[PDB]
Amino acid sequence: DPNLWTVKCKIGEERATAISLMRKFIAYQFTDTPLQIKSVVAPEHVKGYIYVEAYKQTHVKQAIEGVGNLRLGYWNQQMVPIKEMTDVLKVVKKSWVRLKRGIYKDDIAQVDYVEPSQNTISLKMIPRIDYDRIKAPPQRLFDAEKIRSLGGDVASDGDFLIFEGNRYSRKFLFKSFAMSAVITEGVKPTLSELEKFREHNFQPGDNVEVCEGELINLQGKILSVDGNKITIMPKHEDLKDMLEFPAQELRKYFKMGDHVKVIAGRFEGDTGLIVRVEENFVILFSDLTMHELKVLPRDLQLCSETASGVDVGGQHEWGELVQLDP
């Protein structure tokens, strides 16, 4: 069978090079210099080079001595491993969206209305504009009064407004965007985004209890962790055997009087000692701040390093002198 040779092509133009070379093969197959190669493979996820099915590097060279996209690989070619033919052809696989182009790139937008034409969809965005003040941009609420005062390209229709290149806003930019220019799958906006418009996290060394099954009321230390079904190896008390448990069956239960850390939330980054562990509510006194904090068992975590006492930004630490006003 013919062997595969890897030839480098311009990044992002492998499909165009393949189309051009097959067109040239069509044009020159009946001539005195036909292309002796058999086929060409341009995998969708492979960029930078393509594969040519030929018996000889001479045939590969005579085939690729066409468009200049393959000039860099024209000097030399590289065999594809014999076991690699099988891998060559393998292929592996009121909402919210995000724009692809423009200054609104990677920004959450709320799908307000969906046009049946399947051409554009109405989206609600937060304007990343300076209101024609600096240009002759962080997200901020639309200021119709501010843009009207600044003048320029602006049309006032009460709550509705058109400005700076047919950009429409109402009360919040309300503009139509292309179907292919946005991603409708895998956005998952956060609670802050919801306001503007499950998860399993187990780590080694933590103690989790079994809240169901014949192995209930058993607390084991976390040794391994998986995606959904952990099949954990718990170090249960008075049980040397390592059982198996999923993430759902286990709960982040902590013994009375131990240091705990807030993984996330308004209390994130804080440490303290629990006061009373209820069924869901765990009340703790933070160490550096003698503050009572109520958190879920999922939100707690154990570490040997206490709170630094510095702001997240590293500019001010706790118990410091600041300027409320001059």
Partner: protein, 116 residues
């Protein structure tokens, strides 16, 4: 031949039986070139939409089915030279499948992709 060779990259969609990849223009002007006698691809559009799949992964510019281990794998060593899709996502209507079975042409799905 050039008739089977697509002319542009717009509106590409592959057939469900022979995985023939061609545009709506030549599907309208001629339909399929492999099982046109068995399918009556020519002269309509509603049934063409059902009998053709717009989602195909990978294509092969096969021209020599008799001596191609590609053609061996994808079971087109018996079809003509042309452009065929490695994977085709879709299925024929039960009525058309039954008609083909009665005529003696069992419908073999071309969806060779690994679904998870």
């Amino acid at each position: 031949a050039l008739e089977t060779v697509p002319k542009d990259l717009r509106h590409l969609r592959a057939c469900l039986l022979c995985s023939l990849v061609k545009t709506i223009d030549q599907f309208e002007y001629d339909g399929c070139d492999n099982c046109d006698a068995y399918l009556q691809m020519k002269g309509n559009r509603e049934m063409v939409y059902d009998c053709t799949s717009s989602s195909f992964d990978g294509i092969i510019a096969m021209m020599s089915p008799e001596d191609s281990w590609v053609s061996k794998w994808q079971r087109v060593s018996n079809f003509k030279p042309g452009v065929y899709a490695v994977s085709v996502t879709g299925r024929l209507p039960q009525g058309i499948v039954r008609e083909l079975k009665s005529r003696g042409v069992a419908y073999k799905s071309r969806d060779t992709a690994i679904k998870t």
